[PDB]
Design a binder for this molecule. Structure first.
Ligand SMILES: [Cu+]
Length: 125
């Protein structure tokens, strides 16, 4: 089984995939985020945030209210399963999480908290 994924967020405000699969045998899973391009984090920074699909809008709303000062996430938001730091071009960050925090029948989504239009699904498979 493959228990990690490499994902890119670019200067054009896009991730390079809209779907991540976590093999059901994985006990931990690592997301390796990078930022091709040349725009720095104070212009086009990206992170990677994981919640259930049902919780995404709520996380975004409360994140918006929390602002730039908090990378647009409510600190300690229990709905946020895992998240990376905000990165600019040429920078990278990885986050690892316990797959026990995921459930087989539930739908998850990942997104950038700075640019909530940048999103995709994450599924146990
Ligand atoms: Cu972003």
């Amino acid at each position: 089984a493959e228990c990690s994924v490499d994902i890119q967020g670019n200067d054009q405000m896009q991730f390079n995939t809209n779907a991540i699969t976590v093999d059901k045998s994985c006990k931990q899973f690592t997301v390796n985020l990078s930022h091709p391009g040349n725009l720095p984090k104070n212009v086009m920074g990206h992170n990677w945030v994981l919640s259930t699909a049902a919780d995404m809008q709520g996380v975004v709303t409360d994140g918006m209210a929390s602002g730039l000062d908090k990378d647009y996430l409510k600190p300690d938001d229990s709905r946020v399963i895992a998240h990376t730091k905000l990165i600019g071009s040429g920078e990278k960050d990885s986050v690892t999480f316990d797959v026990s925090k995921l459930k087989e029948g539930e739908q998850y989504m990942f997104f950038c908290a700075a640019h909530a239009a940048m999103k995709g699904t994450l599924t146990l498979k």
